[PDB]
PDB file of C-alpha atoms in Angstrom:
ATOM      1  CA  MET E   1       0.000   0.000   0.000  1.00 51.77           C
ATOM      2  CA  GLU E   2       2.743   2.497   0.908  1.00 52.42           C
ATOM      3  CA  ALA E   3       6.501   2.678   0.422  1.00 48.83           C
ATOM      4  CA  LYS E   4       8.938   4.963   2.110  1.00 49.48           C
ATOM      5  CA  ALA E   5      12.611   5.679   2.565  1.00 52.97           C
ATOM      6  CA  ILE E   6      14.525   7.862   4.975  1.00 55.27           C
ATOM      7  CA  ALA E   7      17.980   9.414   4.712  1.00 53.00           C
ATOM      8  CA  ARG E   8      19.482  10.382   8.065  1.00 52.92           C
ATOM      9  CA  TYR E   9      22.134  12.928   9.040  1.00 52.92           C
ATOM     10  CA  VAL E  10      22.252  14.522   5.588  1.00 50.33           C
ATOM     11  CA  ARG E  11      24.753  17.401   5.748  1.00 49.09           C
ATOM     12  CA  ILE E  12      22.341  20.112   4.606  1.00 49.21           C
ATOM     13  CA  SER E  13      20.350  22.729   6.501  1.00 48.65           C
ATOM     14  CA  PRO E  14      16.693  21.699   7.093  1.00 47.02           C
ATOM     15  CA  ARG E  15      15.594  25.161   5.988  1.00 48.65           C
ATOM     16  CA  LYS E  16      17.267  24.631   2.608  1.00 46.90           C
ATOM     17  CA  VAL E  17      15.934  21.094   2.147  1.00 48.63           C
ATOM     18  CA  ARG E  18      12.384  22.165   3.046  1.00 48.13           C
ATOM     19  CA  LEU E  19      12.387  24.392  -0.035  1.00 47.62           C
ATOM     20  CA  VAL E  20      13.038  21.352  -2.204  1.00 46.72           C
ATOM     21  CA  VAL E  21      10.604  18.805  -0.738  1.00 47.16           C
ATOM     22  CA  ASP E  22       7.681  21.220  -1.086  1.00 46.78           C
ATOM     23  CA  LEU E  23       8.273  21.218  -4.830  1.00 45.92           C
ATOM     24  CA  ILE E  24       7.630  17.469  -5.147  1.00 47.70           C
ATOM     25  CA  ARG E  25       4.859  16.732  -2.658  1.00 46.32           C
ATOM     26  CA  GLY E  26       1.814  15.456  -4.544  1.00 47.65           C
ATOM     27  CA  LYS E  27       3.607  15.039  -7.898  1.00 48.78           C
ATOM     28  CA  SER E  28       3.826  11.805  -9.894  1.00 49.21           C
ATOM     29  CA  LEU E  29       7.208  10.064  -9.639  1.00 50.60           C
ATOM     30  CA  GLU E  30       7.984  11.024 -13.233  1.00 51.59           C
ATOM     31  CA  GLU E  31       7.122  14.707 -12.621  1.00 54.78           C
ATOM     32  CA  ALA E  32       9.043  14.782  -9.331  1.00 55.71           C
ATOM     33  CA  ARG E  33      12.224  13.506 -11.049  1.00 60.09           C
ATOM     34  CA  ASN E  34      11.903  16.175 -13.740  1.00 59.82           C
ATOM     35  CA  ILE E  35      11.417  18.946 -11.186  1.00 57.66           C
ATOM     36  CA  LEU E  36      14.503  17.916  -9.207  1.00 57.28           C
ATOM     37  CA  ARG E  37      16.621  17.758 -12.371  1.00 60.11           C
ATOM     38  CA  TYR E  38      15.777  21.269 -13.437  1.00 60.10           C
ATOM     39  CA  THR E  39      15.871  23.050 -10.131  1.00 60.94           C
ATOM     40  CA  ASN E  40      19.270  24.489  -9.200  1.00 60.60           C
ATOM     41  CA  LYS E  41      18.617  24.580  -5.451  1.00 60.37           C
ATOM     42  CA  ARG E  42      21.134  23.168  -3.017  1.00 62.94           C
ATOM     43  CA  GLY E  43      19.585  20.008  -1.659  1.00 61.05           C
ATOM     44  CA  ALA E  44      17.923  18.715  -4.836  1.00 62.10           C
ATOM     45  CA  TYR E  45      20.526  16.005  -5.202  1.00 60.94           C
ATOM     46  CA  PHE E  46      19.902  14.645  -1.705  1.00 60.90           C
ATOM     47  CA  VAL E  47      16.122  14.691  -2.117  1.00 59.10           C
ATOM     48  CA  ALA E  48      16.429  12.981  -5.475  1.00 60.24           C
ATOM     49  CA  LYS E  49      18.513  10.296  -3.809  1.00 59.90           C
ATOM     50  CA  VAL E  50      15.843   9.558  -1.191  1.00 62.56           C
ATOM     51  CA  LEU E  51      13.110   9.601  -3.851  1.00 62.46           C
ATOM     52  CA  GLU E  52      14.984   6.970  -5.830  1.00 61.21           C
ATOM     53  CA  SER E  53      15.382   4.824  -2.698  1.00 63.53           C
ATOM     54  CA  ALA E  54      11.651   5.041  -1.972  1.00 65.86           C
ATOM     55  CA  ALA E  55      10.847   4.026  -5.538  1.00 65.88           C
ATOM     56  CA  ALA E  56      13.194   1.034  -5.308  1.00 65.46           C
ATOM     57  CA  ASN E  57      11.493   0.041  -2.023  1.00 66.12           C
ATOM     58  CA  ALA E  58       8.096   0.281  -3.709  1.00 63.32           C
ATOM     59  CA  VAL E  59       9.216  -1.961  -6.577  1.00 65.92           C
ATOM     60  CA  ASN E  60      11.143  -4.443  -4.410  1.00 67.63           C
ATOM     61  CA  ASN E  61       8.903  -4.674  -1.358  1.00 66.92           C
ATOM     62  CA  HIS E  62       5.364  -4.542  -2.767  1.00 67.52           C
ATOM     63  CA  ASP E  63       6.161  -5.034  -6.460  1.00 67.84           C
ATOM     64  CA  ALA E  64       4.371  -1.728  -7.018  1.00 65.25           C
ATOM     65  CA  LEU E  65       4.395  -0.108 -10.484  1.00 65.09           C
ATOM     66  CA  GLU E  66       6.676   2.907 -10.987  1.00 65.96           C
ATOM     67  CA  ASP E  67       4.311   4.563 -13.467  1.00 64.02           C
ATOM     68  CA  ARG E  68       1.580   4.514 -10.829  1.00 64.05           C
ATOM     69  CA  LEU E  69       3.727   6.001  -8.059  1.00 62.44           C
ATOM     70  CA  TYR E  70       3.264   9.484  -6.623  1.00 67.84           C
ATOM     71  CA  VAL E  71       4.651  11.393  -3.610  1.00 69.09           C
ATOM     72  CA  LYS E  72       2.099  11.324  -0.783  1.00 69.96           C
ATOM     73  CA  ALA E  73       4.423  12.951   1.687  1.00 69.57           C
ATOM     74  CA  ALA E  74       7.893  14.412   1.877  1.00 70.19           C
ATOM     75  CA  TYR E  75       9.164  16.160   4.948  1.00 70.20           C
ATOM     76  CA  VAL E  76      12.291  16.991   6.819  1.00 67.86           C
ATOM     77  CA  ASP E  77      13.202  16.572  10.479  1.00 70.45           C
ATOM     78  CA  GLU E  78      16.008  18.541  12.114  1.00 73.84           C
ATOM     79  CA  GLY E  79      19.137  16.632  12.982  1.00 75.36           C
ATOM     80  CA  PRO E  80      21.915  17.634  15.389  1.00 74.95           C
ATOM     81  CA  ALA E  81      24.494  20.295  14.588  1.00 68.70           C
ATOM     82  CA  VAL E  82      27.841  18.730  13.604  1.00 71.00           C
ATOM     83  CA  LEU E  83      31.489  19.779  13.238  1.00 70.71           C
ATOM     84  CA  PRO E  84      32.929  18.932   9.800  1.00 71.53           C
ATOM     85  CA  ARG E  85      36.549  17.850   9.342  1.00 70.70           C
ATOM     86  CA  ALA E  86      35.731  15.399  12.130  1.00 72.04           C
ATOM     87  CA  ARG E  87      38.507  16.290  14.560  1.00 74.18           C
ATOM     88  CA  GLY E  88      41.138  18.657  13.195  1.00 74.84           C
ATOM     89  CA  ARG E  89      40.655  21.647  15.512  1.00 78.80           C
ATOM     90  CA  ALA E  90      41.051  24.238  12.755  1.00 75.80           C
ATOM     91  CA  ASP E  91      38.825  27.298  12.305  1.00 76.44           C
ATOM     92  CA  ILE E  92      35.579  26.001  10.811  1.00 76.68           C
ATOM     93  CA  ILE E  93      31.926  26.656  11.646  1.00 77.20           C
ATOM     94  CA  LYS E  94      29.241  24.167  12.695  1.00 75.72           C
ATOM     95  CA  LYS E  95      26.615  22.974  10.208  1.00 78.14           C
ATOM     96  CA  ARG E  96      23.075  21.679  10.720  1.00 76.05           C
ATOM     97  CA  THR E  97      21.835  18.314   9.458  1.00 77.92           C
ATOM     98  CA  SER E  98      18.516  16.952   8.200  1.00 75.39           C
ATOM     99  CA  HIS E  99      16.621  13.669   8.193  1.00 73.82           C
ATOM    100  CA  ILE E 100      14.575  13.386   5.007  1.00 76.57           C
ATOM    101  CA  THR E 101      11.500  11.198   4.568  1.00 79.51           C
ATOM    102  CA  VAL E 102       9.637  10.450   1.333  1.00 78.68           C
ATOM    103  CA  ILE E 103       6.478   8.313   1.192  1.00 78.04           C
ATOM    104  CA  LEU E 104       5.175   7.055  -2.143  1.00 78.56           C
ATOM    105  CA  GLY E 105       1.798   5.588  -3.036  1.00 77.37           C
ATOM    106  CA  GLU E 106       0.211   4.627  -6.346  1.00 77.32           C
ATOM    107  CA  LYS E 107      -2.952   5.972  -7.986  1.00 74.40           C
ATOM    108  CA  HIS E 108      -5.465   3.126  -7.613  1.00 74.90           C
ATOM    109  CA  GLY E 109      -4.115  -0.033  -5.978  1.00 74.81           C
ATOM    110  CA  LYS E 110      -4.650  -2.684  -3.294  1.00 77.08           C
TER     111      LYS E 110
ATOM    112  CA  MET J   1       6.660  10.117  11.449  1.00 71.50           C
ATOM    113  CA  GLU J   2       6.451  11.019  15.120  1.00 72.92           C
ATOM    114  CA  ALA J   3       2.755  10.582  15.939  1.00 70.26           C
ATOM    115  CA  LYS J   4       0.404   9.132  13.337  1.00 69.65           C
ATOM    116  CA  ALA J   5      -3.356   8.502  13.266  1.00 70.00           C
ATOM    117  CA  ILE J   6      -5.551   7.128  10.500  1.00 68.40           C
ATOM    118  CA  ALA J   7      -9.260   7.090   9.824  1.00 72.13           C
ATOM    119  CA  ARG J   8     -10.340   4.305   7.476  1.00 72.24           C
ATOM    120  CA  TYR J   9     -13.501   3.819   5.406  1.00 73.39           C
ATOM    121  CA  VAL J  10     -14.686   7.449   5.526  1.00 74.14           C
ATOM    122  CA  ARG J  11     -17.725   7.689   3.291  1.00 76.34           C
ATOM    123  CA  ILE J  12     -16.596  10.773   1.415  1.00 78.71           C
ATOM    124  CA  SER J  13     -14.954  10.930  -2.001  1.00 80.14           C
ATOM    125  CA  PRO J  14     -11.110  11.158  -1.829  1.00 79.62           C
ATOM    126  CA  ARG J  15     -11.211  14.126  -4.227  1.00 81.04           C
ATOM    127  CA  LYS J  16     -13.386  16.055  -1.761  1.00 82.14           C
ATOM    128  CA  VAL J  17     -11.384  15.153   1.352  1.00 82.14           C
ATOM    129  CA  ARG J  18      -8.134  16.078  -0.382  1.00 81.26           C
ATOM    130  CA  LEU J  19      -9.261  19.691  -0.592  1.00 74.36           C
ATOM    131  CA  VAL J  20      -9.390  19.702   3.210  1.00 71.85           C
ATOM    132  CA  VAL J  21      -6.073  18.037   4.036  1.00 71.85           C
ATOM    133  CA  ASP J  22      -4.280  20.367   1.617  1.00 72.57           C
ATOM    134  CA  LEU J  23      -5.323  23.256   3.918  1.00 71.69           C
ATOM    135  CA  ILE J  24      -3.595  21.990   7.059  1.00 70.68           C
ATOM    136  CA  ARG J  25      -0.407  20.427   5.712  1.00 71.29           C
ATOM    137  CA  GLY J  26       2.632  22.077   7.283  1.00 72.26           C
ATOM    138  CA  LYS J  27       0.637  24.177   9.754  1.00 74.71           C
ATOM    139  CA  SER J  28       1.093  24.244  13.509  1.00 76.35           C
ATOM    140  CA  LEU J  29      -1.447  22.151  15.410  1.00 77.99           C
ATOM    141  CA  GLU J  30      -3.186  25.231  16.806  1.00 76.43           C
ATOM    142  CA  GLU J  31      -3.547  26.874  13.393  1.00 74.29           C
ATOM    143  CA  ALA J  32      -4.808  23.669  11.796  1.00 72.51           C
ATOM    144  CA  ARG J  33      -7.536  23.509  14.451  1.00 71.76           C
ATOM    145  CA  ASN J  34      -8.743  27.025  13.612  1.00 73.26           C
ATOM    146  CA  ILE J  35      -8.565  26.306   9.888  1.00 74.86           C
ATOM    147  CA  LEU J  36     -10.855  23.287  10.272  1.00 73.42           C
ATOM    148  CA  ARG J  37     -13.290  25.162  12.506  1.00 78.59           C
ATOM    149  CA  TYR J  38     -13.762  27.904   9.904  1.00 81.36           C
ATOM    150  CA  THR J  39     -13.643  25.846   6.740  1.00 81.03           C
ATOM    151  CA  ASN J  40     -17.050  25.078   5.254  1.00 78.68           C
ATOM    152  CA  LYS J  41     -16.027  22.018   3.240  1.00 78.36           C
ATOM    153  CA  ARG J  42     -17.392  18.515   3.534  1.00 78.65           C
ATOM    154  CA  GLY J  43     -14.975  16.223   5.311  1.00 78.05           C
ATOM    155  CA  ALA J  44     -13.668  18.835   7.753  1.00 77.64           C
ATOM    156  CA  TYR J  45     -15.161  16.900  10.665  1.00 75.82           C
ATOM    157  CA  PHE J  46     -13.420  13.634   9.810  1.00 73.63           C
ATOM    158  CA  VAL J  47     -10.091  15.384   9.270  1.00 71.80           C
ATOM    159  CA  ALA J  48     -10.493  17.162  12.598  1.00 73.53           C
ATOM    160  CA  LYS J  49     -11.127  13.838  14.304  1.00 70.37           C
ATOM    161  CA  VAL J  50      -7.979  12.244  12.918  1.00 70.07           C
ATOM    162  CA  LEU J  51      -5.956  15.360  13.859  1.00 69.27           C
ATOM    163  CA  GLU J  52      -7.209  15.259  17.406  1.00 70.91           C
ATOM    164  CA  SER J  53      -6.434  11.548  17.675  1.00 71.85           C
ATOM    165  CA  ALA J  54      -2.903  12.180  16.506  1.00 73.21           C
ATOM    166  CA  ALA J  55      -2.567  15.115  18.908  1.00 77.10           C
ATOM    167  CA  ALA J  56      -3.774  13.022  21.877  1.00 78.88           C
ATOM    168  CA  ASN J  57      -1.279  10.268  21.011  1.00 81.01           C
ATOM    169  CA  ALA J  58       1.573  12.773  20.597  1.00 81.22           C
ATOM    170  CA  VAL J  59       1.014  14.497  23.944  1.00 81.18           C
ATOM    171  CA  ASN J  60      -0.182  11.584  26.081  1.00 80.18           C
ATOM    172  CA  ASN J  61       2.118   8.823  24.863  1.00 77.94           C
ATOM    173  CA  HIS J  62       5.017  10.443  23.029  1.00 77.46           C
ATOM    174  CA  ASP J  63       5.554  13.133  25.637  1.00 78.26           C
ATOM    175  CA  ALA J  64       5.620  15.720  22.831  1.00 80.23           C
ATOM    176  CA  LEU J  65       4.730  19.375  23.546  1.00 81.35           C
ATOM    177  CA  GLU J  66       1.463  20.610  22.048  1.00 80.49           C
ATOM    178  CA  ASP J  67       2.976  24.066  21.407  1.00 83.60           C
ATOM    179  CA  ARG J  68       5.616  22.588  19.093  1.00 83.41           C
ATOM    180  CA  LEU J  69       3.470  20.141  17.130  1.00 82.67           C
ATOM    181  CA  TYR J  70       2.852  20.716  13.434  1.00 83.40           C
ATOM    182  CA  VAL J  71       1.295  18.676  10.609  1.00 79.14           C
ATOM    183  CA  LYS J  72       4.323  17.076   8.923  1.00 77.12           C
ATOM    184  CA  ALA J  73       2.120  15.109   6.563  1.00 76.11           C
ATOM    185  CA  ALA J  74      -1.550  14.641   5.760  1.00 77.81           C
ATOM    186  CA  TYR J  75      -2.876  12.628   2.842  1.00 77.56           C
ATOM    187  CA  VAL J  76      -5.786  10.589   1.564  1.00 76.47           C
ATOM    188  CA  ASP J  77      -5.802   7.107   0.057  1.00 77.50           C
ATOM    189  CA  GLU J  78      -8.611   5.595  -1.997  1.00 76.01           C
ATOM    190  CA  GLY J  79     -10.728   3.105  -0.090  1.00 73.52           C
ATOM    191  CA  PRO J  80     -13.337   0.469  -1.093  1.00 74.63           C
ATOM    192  CA  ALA J  81     -16.009   1.418  -3.609  1.00 74.73           C
ATOM    193  CA  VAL J  82     -19.722   1.867  -2.999  1.00 72.33           C
ATOM    194  CA  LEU J  83     -22.148   0.403  -5.558  1.00 71.71           C
ATOM    195  CA  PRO J  84     -25.270   2.300  -6.864  1.00 70.28           C
ATOM    196  CA  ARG J  85     -27.589  -0.181  -5.123  1.00 67.73           C
ATOM    197  CA  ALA J  86     -27.313  -2.766  -2.336  1.00 69.40           C
ATOM    198  CA  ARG J  87     -28.972  -5.559  -4.293  1.00 68.74           C
ATOM    199  CA  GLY J  88     -29.477  -6.580  -7.901  1.00 67.81           C
ATOM    200  CA  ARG J  89     -27.226  -6.085 -10.917  1.00 67.81           C
ATOM    201  CA  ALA J  90     -24.773  -3.151 -10.830  1.00 67.59           C
ATOM    202  CA  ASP J  91     -22.674  -2.008 -13.781  1.00 64.58           C
ATOM    203  CA  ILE J  92     -20.831   1.001 -12.373  1.00 63.00           C
ATOM    204  CA  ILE J  93     -19.220   2.277  -9.164  1.00 62.05           C
ATOM    205  CA  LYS J  94     -21.100   5.123  -7.487  1.00 58.90           C
ATOM    206  CA  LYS J  95     -18.187   6.547  -5.508  1.00 57.65           C
ATOM    207  CA  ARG J  96     -15.093   5.539  -3.569  1.00 56.43           C
ATOM    208  CA  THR J  97     -14.515   5.881   0.184  1.00 56.89           C
ATOM    209  CA  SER J  98     -11.305   7.257   1.681  1.00 58.15           C
ATOM    210  CA  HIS J  99      -8.612   6.605   4.298  1.00 58.78           C
ATOM    211  CA  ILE J 100      -7.115   9.677   5.917  1.00 62.04           C
ATOM    212  CA  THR J 101      -3.668   9.849   7.476  1.00 62.75           C
ATOM    213  CA  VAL J 102      -2.148  12.618   9.601  1.00 64.83           C
ATOM    214  CA  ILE J 103       1.414  12.627  10.952  1.00 64.57           C
ATOM    215  CA  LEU J 104       2.458  15.122  13.598  1.00 63.81           C
ATOM    216  CA  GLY J 105       6.023  16.030  14.507  1.00 63.92           C
ATOM    217  CA  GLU J 106       7.775  18.642  16.620  1.00 65.09           C
ATOM    218  CA  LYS J 107       8.919  22.093  15.409  1.00 65.82           C
ATOM    219  CA  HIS J 108      11.781  22.741  12.941  1.00 67.92           C
ATOM    220  CA  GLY J 109      11.736  21.298   9.449  1.00 69.47           C
ATOM    221  CA  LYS J 110       8.921  21.171   6.902  1.00 68.78           C
TER     222      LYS J 110
END
């Protein structure tokens, strides 16, 4: 009935990612892919990656049909702040992370 | 997907209920409540019921704070069909029922 995928600790600000997921909510899988390819917003690549994982889960788990898939939900949860360069005590700032969730469903199913 | 509630077999056409859930997606819990109270669309009552169930679960069981809750996702799936008559031959579907899902989460992100 439903397929989903989640990407955790993505190194992008939730505020930036939110801009991208709102573009694809409610769109067919085909339309969502097209939108993400032609937007130039930082974060598109990461959202496209989760979308492709959700589609694979739909096809592998429930043998759902990709041409019937659409984005029922897409949202972002705030992750912890993290210090890049792991541990090198230089002079770098802290960046926020995001957890991205995409849920796909198909028009007419079982 | 912090706190989720679902209402199944709602005897209202998915197309009609969708117009209601689109209004509250992404809003804070308090604003969604006011939106539903003032909206004069069929299905508002059933959406309100699912929202309140999700809110009760979030606050009572998940120890989440009502002031930080927002509608991360809200969507409608197509449910079983209703025939034109209860007995005798039928050659068309009258309408479809709907399943409504609402997922609440805390603050930041969208």
